Design a protein around this nucleic acid. Sequence first.
DNA 1: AACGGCAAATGCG
DNA 2: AACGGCAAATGCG
DNA 3: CGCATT
DNA 4: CGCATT
Lengths: 762, 713
Amino acid sequence: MILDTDYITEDGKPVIRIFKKENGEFKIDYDRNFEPYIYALLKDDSAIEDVKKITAERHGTTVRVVRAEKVKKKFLGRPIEVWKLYFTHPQDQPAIRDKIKEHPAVVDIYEYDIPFAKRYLIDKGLIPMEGDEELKMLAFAIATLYHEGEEFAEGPILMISYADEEGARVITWKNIDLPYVDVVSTEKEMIKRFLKVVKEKDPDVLITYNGDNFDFAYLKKRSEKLGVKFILGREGSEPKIQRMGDRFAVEVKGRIHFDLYPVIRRTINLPTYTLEAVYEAIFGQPKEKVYAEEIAQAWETGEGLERVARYSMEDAKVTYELGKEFFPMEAQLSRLVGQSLWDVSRSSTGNLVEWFLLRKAYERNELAPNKPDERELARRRESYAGGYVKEPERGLWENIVYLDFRSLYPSIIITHNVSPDTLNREGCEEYDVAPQVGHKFCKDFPGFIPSLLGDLLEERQKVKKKMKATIDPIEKKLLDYRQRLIKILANSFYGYYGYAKARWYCKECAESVTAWGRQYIETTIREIEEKFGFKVLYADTDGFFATIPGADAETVKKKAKEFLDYINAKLPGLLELEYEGFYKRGFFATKKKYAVIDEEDKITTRGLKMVRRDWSEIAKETQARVLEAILKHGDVEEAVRIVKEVTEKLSKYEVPPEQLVIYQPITKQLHDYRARGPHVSVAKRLAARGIKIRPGTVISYIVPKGSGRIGDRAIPFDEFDPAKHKYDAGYYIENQVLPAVERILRAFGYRKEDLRYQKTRQ
Amino acid sequence: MILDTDYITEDGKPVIRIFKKENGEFKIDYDRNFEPYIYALLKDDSAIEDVKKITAERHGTTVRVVRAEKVKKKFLGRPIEVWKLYFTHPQDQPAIRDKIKEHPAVVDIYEYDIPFAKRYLIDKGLIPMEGDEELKMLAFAIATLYHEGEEFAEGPILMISYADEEGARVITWKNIDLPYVDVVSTEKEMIKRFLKVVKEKDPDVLITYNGDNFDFAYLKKRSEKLGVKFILGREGSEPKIQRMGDRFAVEVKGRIHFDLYPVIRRTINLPTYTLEAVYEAIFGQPKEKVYAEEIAQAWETGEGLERVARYSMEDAKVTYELGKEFFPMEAQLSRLVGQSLWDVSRSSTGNLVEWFLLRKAYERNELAPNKPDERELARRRESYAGGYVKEPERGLWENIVYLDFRSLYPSIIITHNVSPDTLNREGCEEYDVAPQVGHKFCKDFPGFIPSLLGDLLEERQKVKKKMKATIDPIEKKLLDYRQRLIKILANSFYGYYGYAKARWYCKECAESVTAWGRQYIETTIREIEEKFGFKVLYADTDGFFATIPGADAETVKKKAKEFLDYINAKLPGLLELEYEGFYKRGFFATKKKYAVIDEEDKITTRGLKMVRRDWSEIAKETQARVLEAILKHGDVEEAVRIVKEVTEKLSKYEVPPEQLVIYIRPGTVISYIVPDEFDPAKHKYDAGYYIENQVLPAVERILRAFGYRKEDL
DNA sequence: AACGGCAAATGCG
DNA sequence: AACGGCAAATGCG
DNA sequence: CGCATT
DNA sequence: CGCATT
Ligand SMILES: Cc1cn([C@H]2C[C@H](O)[C@@H](COP(=O)(O)OP(=O)(O)OP(=O)(O)O)O2)c(=O)[nH]c1=O
Ligand SMILES: Cc1cn([C@H]2C[C@H](O)[C@@H](COP(=O)(O)OP(=O)(O)OP(=O)(O)O)O2)c(=O)[nH]c1=O
Ligand SMILES: [Mg+2]
Ligand SMILES: [Mg+2]
Ligand SMILES: [Mn+2]
Ligand SMILES: [Mn+2]
Ligand SMILES: [Mn+2]
Ligand SMILES: [Mn+2]
């Protein structure tokens, strides 16, 4: 299989290098004949004589057009003849493309900003990560000596740990007596030993957790200080640190540096992305965190260094385990997009779609449209109508089914041939007209993007069938992320039509997809209510919750399956409504906010959690009891007795002050805050008192009754005393308990006045 | 008359500038001898040799202590000897004060954060705005070209309008044919013409409405783009834009930039503070609003520019008229506090109290306590018991008198000598002990704050006497705001004791004032009920509504006057209960919520009416009829027949849809109906909405007191 | 700009 | 590195 | 405006 | 809390 491609320059000419692993052997193949080029559309063919003579400069070197070739291509399916302008070196292109575009005889230029190594993979039809080749993997982590107020990598690396299928080891330059610890004389010998381990093991994949921004840069500064050639690359090169957006990315030539951080960050939704939080979220097992301040104290005092070495060993061990689980998903994405694993694992969804389209356009002899200029970008900022969100039905409902369209927007694109090359194309025998917006789409030939979505949907469904049939819950969770990645990718082709920077931008296509979606959902709602006696409780874009008011579970399931057979027979092409779930009870508060309970007693809440906001244990506990009373017990009157009980106890000062602690994290330096909330106000006072506040510190505070605003009175819970200080009962009622439970009890007709304590007169 | 003070630096030394207007002539007086200083309390006098040698740095400049002087002062009435540490420049103080405080021989430092120019006004005994000097005033406004999604001042100023006693004019760079419009060639010539107008007129006061945050900053960016020296200051300086908390404030040196916005914002309570809303609230006359989008379209198309010029002219005209009315109040406040009009018009009530106390402390050789640090601020957030609020007696009551104490909390402070310097002071022959909280206050000598409140109460009563005898309702309304500002100022000395940032903070003093107030009101209630046979219906802090159940108007008034004579003879010092009003009928719903009607048929409602944007005429009209039936007719059964009549008519679609109207640009009123050009022959209004969300919520809050719930209505 | 986010508690919704 | 932005709208708070 | 739900 | 009444 092909792992990656790049290019080097030999005598001013580029040489493509293809990094491969074939039959367990690493190989580098060289192509010295592939030439860079761009296209030019001219107003007249005779002007090519003047265009061939255009020159530019590139550090003393005169840049010239090597040769030209008139080629017949297509632009949005319409034939167009352009001139393929060849160059000696890819860096000639940025130096001369503006001068060629500015020539009076040149109407426009195309495919001028495609990186040379990626252009090679596309033009040669090569796809990375193909085949039954087994890759050797090795994860690594570093433990460093940190002291606040110091420059980056000023302190030494204390330990370098690594892990693979054979186990995990730690290299350190202090005498720690553990079986997996290798003790060396100095930091220099430790780095040299790690470099030796990677050369001996010769891994195809180097796994890190944030190695793109921390591990490699730290190793680089330490190697520069110690005079060590950190030759990790298979061709003797050192790691190549490049700028990627607002951060950095690191390559190790001949190997795949798989940094798990960007992959995990876009795959799983978590409040924190520490290696410990990621490991527990995936494997359901805890990982102990040993902080930087503890590592430094253990090193300087010599005490408890076994705990630091164990923490370091487990960093490498869990990074290897996480790498094993997430690599198959990324390797499949590399095959789909047709680009290296290093690229697809770090690139945005917009870039994945664009790289996939550039390849398919090449296969189909289609000229790629250019990225918009500043003027065109300003023209593409207008929005369009999206999905339909029904206002939910107030009240408690029983025996509810959730029906949802399978891959709605991609199925609409395939069925109705929604593409920029089919939009208002004259001369066709057949058209599909988008409702409301009226855009017409030619149906005589498959459109560019519609013809490509089918295979993605087929691939996703194969993964879903594998998933539902998986015994292992970890493997099933990873297959769930895999099918969801393809689901998000397929939907991003729709989004891409309305994305201002898209090459194949088509706002008409985007608003037609949403218009057809709005038509299908509203028609389906009308159909289930009028033909089958269902009541649609709530709907959002392509799915809805419905029930037959006076019917048992067996009847509602039976009639939902009858409706699905009926509606699926009426729906055209790839459009299909699926049975997604059954819920015993369910309440629908507002749009995007509701809670449902399945037959196994599992509650699913959407828009109700709101965990980023500041919540007290009393508000969390009250909302938990309210939802338990409504969904589990089916008793709305009990839920309102709980809220009235809590507000009465808060007013009477009967609630233990332990339930009033608000915990919220400090996420940056205290000086870097724009707005000062209660948690920041407490933290600034604690910092002034000598307490070390750092990003990650949780502030546990309580609001007392007093003079100033919330943050002014707010104090740490370690300073509160119920025998001296009276808590702010009104705050816990009006700002914590009531806002959280009112949004739920709105559905049953209860307002804030009904939830508050009686205040009876004597 | 002193308008303002500031300082400049000449050869590293400060020079105070006093901006004056004497006999119609503007003058600048200079003081080159006033020195900055702070105080240090040392553990031993010999350590002054080490303290004198402390140095700091200030951009390459070595900061040193110029000289020291041992001075005898008082800290909370107790003699304390401190060292007055003098410096060359006021900016030396922030650079070296922490190093002096951190010295092991220094116990504490004082008066280290007083701005130099304000320190000068205090130490010299100078008070701004004194005398019968007449000030020349000029208001101004600007009309700009706005386009959404652009940076601040990216578009030009289209018109600059100004107004004074001689009239209002508009300078613009487009040919508009109006008598008051002066047409110039460019935006540059318009700004230069405006600068010329202000230099020629030479006004003492420049009036704006939000000029601190919009007008001056817009002019600044446009002048920087056009290369114009905007020398508005009398010394040739440009407007000085400074940060004041979360907003900005602008000075024009030698003149008083009077921005009406902060003054109006704290004086009048309104849902919106647009210039149009403020003008109608004060003068009772409407002002048309021409929006930014209309101004831009008029300018780009050339159509209807007369309407824009008229709007611009009226902005300057009404800002001048409002400025004339609000300047006397602010000029008097400047004399009371002893600080410039620019400062007193923009500072909070707590800063006015503090600047007044800093001046009085200087006069009395009293060291000012320091403001608290973050740790001390956190220690002062504990609350204390406030006023007493009696649960009201439900039902409709007749022939009710309202008796209320005159300046309660300030009178308690004066009578019982409630002050931080008299609190638990040992050695006195006489004390007053606060009830419940038990704090003792020495009575042998007048306390600092108690000795200052008497003159404020005297001043307020002089304004009240003038007010009640004023024929003009506008002048009477302005005097009402003036006496109320002194009433709130006097009550803020009490609040100041319990204010965490206060220098003269004393929570014991604050809770003793409230404790004495709770004792006087509950004692008075017990006294009127047990001795005079009255029934106290409702009470809040220092006043109560009472009646003699089976008595006519003449009897209740007569017996209330007899009780006042009796109770006033028992009350000590400055404590006095006043006859504040008589009401034919009154209904008391909950605490802070009730409605009373006087003999002239005027209804006063507290806590009942709301400033909500959703006012349907049917809900307002129904609530008006309900209150009229309860207070005028004394018939609860009629009020409930009215609500049942309205809900029945709404259900039957008999109410005209004009009574159901509820009423993006800031200030735009939306007039809508729940189902603008509604048609009863096609559309049916939401009867249930007008019953359950408009009529019932408004009238139920009132009919609750008589036992009626939403189901009965 | 140096001093300015802050006068207090009680109570309803 | 030469490419690289971070696929879309609806809706609550 | 950010984040959550599609 | 937010705003109104003291
Ligand atoms: C989740 C999601 C939805 N949408 C749009 C397109 C989807 O077709 C539509 C409905 O959302 P979904 O029901 O979440 O997605 P889906 O129909 O594509 O997939 P599935 O078979 O699992 O139901 O909302 C996006 O544009 N982007 C997204 O990431
Ligand atoms: C109005 C008001 C009252 N209070 C306190 C102190 C007052 O003395 C007490 C009673 O309020 P008021 O009766 O409104 O005020 P007053 O007694 O000072 O003045 P008047 O002679 O007009 O009756 O409530 C404040 O602390 N701040 C205020 O702004
Ligand atoms: Mg869905
Ligand atoms: Mg009163
Ligand atoms: Mn689905
Ligand atoms: Mn779907
Ligand atoms: Mn009074
Ligand atoms: Mn009073």
